[PDB]
């Protein structure tokens, strides 16, 4: 059985829109804990991380709210490390994706040999020098990669960071809106990726086959799945800040994670960018959150073909 | 050419919702007969089966309306057997899926070597002892399978039944909402299935290849396709009682059946669970019924690439 | 780098609906030129072709507005030939698909060894004798094929035409609504096609592999892609005259063209049948045109995985 450690991370300062903070809340009000308990899941809730307020957080060059973002990630990282030392799969119900910096870091401190599957429409690998917006939810991967060391300036609030994963230990799935500099980084750092073009070409099945062998071919190491709800199509997860048309299917999102589950190697998981305040209607909020819950439950066992306990049902 | 024998089965007592009874009506008002005639189809309509009224039909344990359901199925079975003896492909335009018990049975009486392709979101293999609802439209397959003999209690109104197909002669396509006991039965009776996870993995093409060789590998036996409109996604067939997200595509539904047609071995066909009364809007009823008609016409020849008679069009 | 030559073709007399004329306008107001310039694209706009008015254009047998259609195509053909002699990829932003007759012809005059990929829900290969409607936007391919010579009557306004491509040099992708006579022609002239049934079966990836080797196997010849917006599903391009359910995906449409781009052999391109006047709502017009623009930009380099200039972004 796989034990979970819910880490509620109500943070939004990684981008403009604020309703992303109430994500852990809407996901819990959906029933995530209870639903996980109906399965063979042992759940321990480490509550919501009460991220402080830093009023004096002016921009660094063009980088926005660095101290708040860097501090929320430093806070998240210790909890993730805590739950992992507790022998539990950390489930970070977050707001924006900047929290990944602290999630992968915290996870790597206890499991330095971790592998990352990054599901998203964007690569989020911009540096403080290549970013055009400044929103740090589009910059996490650059703070985490060892090879991109020496190319990221000293962002106030991130001094604590130490690049933990190398470009060879991460796979992207779902790309379709990647900036010029980010693309340069991908081809230059030789990052394996499966944008929507490769999903179309090879199919969701082949893509997973290749991503799992790519990361577990040499050995069987822990897997960190950082899932951004906008990796899925905006017809399934509309309530998100940066939606891009032509996304992963509801089916593909479930296939992605059922396969991840099946490796039995999941150790870290992030479900981010669900902003109920961005729903056009009340049902759009519902369609977004429900899809978010469904993918979470599949990361922990829920299979479409069916599930049954080890007993004689007849 | 393939001759058809329309058997209108207006029945709903296999579940709570009643608008499923007016299914044969909405499908006929759509033009099914006329549309089939535009093809190389010979159609003979055996009318709608006037299912009696059984007022004294209290529950059996938790099993609901057994005598009505068992009687409608006993009635349907003879007609199906009748049309088959008439050398015609029985087309059961039904209401709920409990009618399958009588459809496969009636068909098997004349063709005991039949194979079944069950398109659905559910396996409908609950027994009177494993069911939680009691609705018999979620129990048909258990009354039909020989191996599940000795595990189904004597349900008033079903004494006439004799398990006709063995767990080895049926394939499910489209699963994604299967109960714990049903799943136990699947793995225990070794039933071949293709839930949405396998469709995602292998593709709709591979799935059909495997289902047709699985059933026709040894010999070329008659094929009974029991099609539940909710096997398709709720974006194509919304007007149905038990819709589950992440279903088969409009395209996949047409691919399924064009391939079935192409075997030239179709002998039995059911198009069930279309409930026009469950439409949120008038167009949802239209989208459901039209999709239902489209899949029917493909079971009898209509191909997307085109169709032409044996003559010189130029 | 690939240079473009925009040929605005505001014509509608190939079918009943007139709002297709304002297609070049809505596509330009969307930003097609500007967007192409953000890429490594050299764009030269040859303006909109001012198609004359022919009031005395009564039907030929059942063929409608032949002189206007034949004259608009004769006009378009010279411009296409002009831009091609200018060493530029002709981009015909049209109205209805009858304009293809002049587009492929004009293109073939300068590049007789051209190959055609025809993306559509229909084959548009009806002759003046096999057509039931008379709308010439459903007849273009028959005027262009050499083998169908002797089977098309002398349509006033088309005398200038000379069949330029043979049945062996064209591939259809996306078919699902083909008439009996057209189908006869396909099987008789041995035209390679990939209707929606083959896309479902083999996948969009395999389909392109086979279409590109089918046309470029012997040599590397110029490619003419005639793209009809209704080849895509009506959920992506609703504002079109003849929409048919179960079309190509947004993703598949982008995959089709990214692959075409990647051959580096695109020379001719048509983006037709966008009729903003057929939108049910203002956003349907937007969804249609935006999808139209997206596919255009992919024909000229825009890749979902990302794009970057030959420089050191770090
Ligand atoms: Mn992200
Ligand atoms: Mn994203
Ligand atoms: Mn059913
Ligand atoms: Mn069902
Ligand atoms: Mn066309
Ligand atoms: Mn068309």
Short mmCIF file of N, CA, C and O in Angstrom, two decimals, chain B residues 27-70:
data_model
loop_
_atom_site.label_atom_id
_atom_site.label_comp_id
_atom_site.label_asym_id
_atom_site.label_seq_id
_atom_site.Cartn_x
_atom_site.Cartn_y
_atom_site.Cartn_z
N UNK B 27 -35.96 6.69 -31.93
CA UNK B 27 -35.02 6.16 -32.93
C UNK B 27 -35.70 5.95 -34.28
O UNK B 27 -35.07 6.08 -35.33
N UNK B 28 -36.99 5.60 -34.23
CA UNK B 28 -37.78 5.39 -35.44
C UNK B 28 -38.18 6.74 -36.03
O UNK B 28 -38.22 6.89 -37.25
N UNK B 29 -38.47 7.71 -35.16
CA UNK B 29 -38.85 9.05 -35.58
C UNK B 29 -37.62 9.77 -36.14
O UNK B 29 -37.73 10.84 -36.75
N UNK B 30 -36.46 9.17 -35.93
CA UNK B 30 -35.21 9.73 -36.42
C UNK B 30 -35.05 9.28 -37.88
O UNK B 30 -34.44 9.98 -38.70
N UNK B 31 -35.61 8.12 -38.19
CA UNK B 31 -35.56 7.59 -39.54
C UNK B 31 -34.77 6.31 -39.73
O UNK B 31 -34.49 5.93 -40.87
N UNK B 32 -34.43 5.62 -38.64
CA UNK B 32 -33.64 4.38 -38.75
C UNK B 32 -34.06 3.43 -39.87
O UNK B 32 -33.22 2.97 -40.64
N UNK B 33 -35.35 3.13 -39.98
CA UNK B 33 -35.82 2.22 -41.03
C UNK B 33 -35.51 2.78 -42.41
O UNK B 33 -34.87 2.12 -43.23
N UNK B 34 -35.97 3.99 -42.67
CA UNK B 34 -35.75 4.62 -43.96
C UNK B 34 -34.27 4.70 -44.32
O UNK B 34 -33.89 4.40 -45.46
N UNK B 35 -33.43 5.10 -43.36
CA UNK B 35 -31.99 5.23 -43.59
C UNK B 35 -31.34 3.89 -43.94
O UNK B 35 -30.44 3.83 -44.77
N UNK B 36 -31.81 2.82 -43.30
CA UNK B 36 -31.30 1.49 -43.57
C UNK B 36 -31.71 1.07 -44.98
O UNK B 36 -30.98 0.33 -45.64
N UNK B 37 -32.86 1.54 -45.44
CA UNK B 37 -33.34 1.18 -46.77
C UNK B 37 -32.57 1.85 -47.91
O UNK B 37 -32.56 1.35 -49.03
N UNK B 38 -31.93 2.97 -47.61
CA UNK B 38 -31.14 3.70 -48.61
C UNK B 38 -29.86 2.92 -48.94
O UNK B 38 -29.19 3.19 -49.94
N UNK B 39 -29.53 1.97 -48.07
CA UNK B 39 -28.35 1.12 -48.22
C UNK B 39 -28.83 -0.19 -48.86
O UNK B 39 -29.97 -0.28 -49.31
N UNK B 40 -27.97 -1.20 -48.93
CA UNK B 40 -28.37 -2.48 -49.52
C UNK B 40 -29.05 -3.32 -48.45
O UNK B 40 -28.88 -4.55 -48.39
N UNK B 41 -29.84 -2.66 -47.61
CA UNK B 41 -30.53 -3.32 -46.50
C UNK B 41 -31.98 -3.69 -46.73
O UNK B 41 -32.78 -2.88 -47.21
N UNK B 42 -32.30 -4.93 -46.37
CA UNK B 42 -33.64 -5.50 -46.46
C UNK B 42 -34.17 -5.43 -45.02
O UNK B 42 -33.70 -6.16 -44.15
N UNK B 43 -35.13 -4.55 -44.77
CA UNK B 43 -35.66 -4.37 -43.42
C UNK B 43 -37.10 -4.83 -43.22
O UNK B 43 -37.99 -4.47 -43.98
N UNK B 44 -37.29 -5.64 -42.17
CA UNK B 44 -38.61 -6.15 -41.80
C UNK B 44 -38.82 -5.80 -40.33
O UNK B 44 -38.10 -6.28 -39.45
N UNK B 45 -39.82 -4.95 -40.07
CA UNK B 45 -40.10 -4.49 -38.72
C UNK B 45 -41.10 -5.35 -37.96
O UNK B 45 -42.27 -5.43 -38.32
N UNK B 46 -40.62 -5.99 -36.90
CA UNK B 46 -41.47 -6.83 -36.08
C UNK B 46 -42.19 -6.01 -35.01
O UNK B 46 -42.61 -6.55 -33.99
N UNK B 47 -42.32 -4.71 -35.26
CA UNK B 47 -42.99 -3.81 -34.34
C UNK B 47 -42.33 -3.64 -32.98
O UNK B 47 -41.18 -4.05 -32.78
N UNK B 48 -43.05 -3.02 -32.06
CA UNK B 48 -42.57 -2.81 -30.69
C UNK B 48 -43.19 -3.89 -29.83
O UNK B 48 -44.40 -4.14 -29.93
N UNK B 49 -42.39 -4.52 -28.98
CA UNK B 49 -42.90 -5.56 -28.09
C UNK B 49 -43.74 -4.92 -26.98
O UNK B 49 -43.22 -4.18 -26.14
N UNK B 50 -45.05 -5.19 -26.96
CA UNK B 50 -45.96 -4.64 -25.94
C UNK B 50 -45.77 -5.36 -24.61
O UNK B 50 -46.47 -6.32 -24.31
N UNK B 51 -44.80 -4.89 -23.83
CA UNK B 51 -44.50 -5.50 -22.54
C UNK B 51 -45.60 -5.24 -21.52
O UNK B 51 -45.95 -4.10 -21.24
N UNK B 52 -46.15 -6.33 -20.98
CA UNK B 52 -47.23 -6.27 -20.01
C UNK B 52 -46.92 -5.47 -18.75
O UNK B 52 -45.81 -5.00 -18.52
N UNK B 53 -47.95 -5.34 -17.92
CA UNK B 53 -47.85 -4.61 -16.68
C UNK B 53 -47.98 -5.61 -15.54
O UNK B 53 -48.95 -6.37 -15.48
N UNK B 54 -46.99 -5.63 -14.66
CA UNK B 54 -47.02 -6.51 -13.50
C UNK B 54 -46.98 -5.59 -12.28
O UNK B 54 -45.91 -5.16 -11.86
N UNK B 55 -48.16 -5.26 -11.73
CA UNK B 55 -48.29 -4.38 -10.55
C UNK B 55 -47.75 -5.00 -9.26
O UNK B 55 -47.19 -4.30 -8.42
N UNK B 56 -47.94 -6.31 -9.11
CA UNK B 56 -47.47 -7.03 -7.93
C UNK B 56 -46.07 -7.58 -8.16
O UNK B 56 -45.86 -8.78 -8.32
N UNK B 57 -45.11 -6.66 -8.17
CA UNK B 57 -43.73 -7.01 -8.42
C UNK B 57 -42.80 -6.37 -7.39
O UNK B 57 -41.94 -5.55 -7.73
N UNK B 58 -43.00 -6.74 -6.12
CA UNK B 58 -42.18 -6.24 -5.02
C UNK B 58 -40.76 -6.80 -5.17
O UNK B 58 -40.54 -7.80 -5.85
N UNK B 59 -39.78 -6.16 -4.52
CA UNK B 59 -38.37 -6.60 -4.59
C UNK B 59 -38.08 -8.03 -4.11
O UNK B 59 -38.80 -8.58 -3.28
N UNK B 60 -37.01 -8.61 -4.66
CA UNK B 60 -36.53 -9.94 -4.27
C UNK B 60 -35.23 -9.58 -3.57
O UNK B 60 -34.25 -9.21 -4.22
N UNK B 61 -35.22 -9.68 -2.24
CA UNK B 61 -34.06 -9.27 -1.47
C UNK B 61 -33.92 -7.80 -1.83
O UNK B 61 -34.76 -6.99 -1.44
N UNK B 62 -32.89 -7.45 -2.60
CA UNK B 62 -32.71 -6.06 -3.01
C UNK B 62 -32.94 -5.89 -4.51
O UNK B 62 -32.92 -4.77 -5.02
N UNK B 63 -33.17 -7.00 -5.21
CA UNK B 63 -33.40 -7.00 -6.66
C UNK B 63 -34.76 -6.40 -6.97
O UNK B 63 -35.78 -6.91 -6.51
N UNK B 64 -34.77 -5.33 -7.77
CA UNK B 64 -35.99 -4.62 -8.15
C UNK B 64 -36.70 -5.05 -9.44
O UNK B 64 -36.06 -5.40 -10.42
N UNK B 65 -38.04 -5.01 -9.41
CA UNK B 65 -38.91 -5.37 -10.54
C UNK B 65 -38.46 -6.59 -11.35
O UNK B 65 -38.41 -6.54 -12.59
N UNK B 66 -38.13 -7.71 -10.67
CA UNK B 66 -37.68 -8.94 -11.32
C UNK B 66 -38.64 -9.62 -12.30
O UNK B 66 -38.23 -10.05 -13.39
N UNK B 67 -39.90 -9.73 -11.93
CA UNK B 67 -40.90 -10.37 -12.78
C UNK B 67 -41.16 -9.60 -14.08
O UNK B 67 -41.34 -10.19 -15.14
N UNK B 68 -41.17 -8.27 -13.99
CA UNK B 68 -41.39 -7.42 -15.16
C UNK B 68 -40.18 -7.53 -16.08
O UNK B 68 -40.33 -7.75 -17.29
N UNK B 69 -39.00 -7.39 -15.49
CA UNK B 69 -37.74 -7.49 -16.23
C UNK B 69 -37.56 -8.90 -16.80
O UNK B 69 -37.19 -9.06 -17.96
N UNK B 70 -37.82 -9.91 -15.97
CA UNK B 70 -37.68 -11.28 -16.42
C UNK B 70 -38.70 -11.64 -17.49
O UNK B 70 -38.43 -12.45 -18.38
#
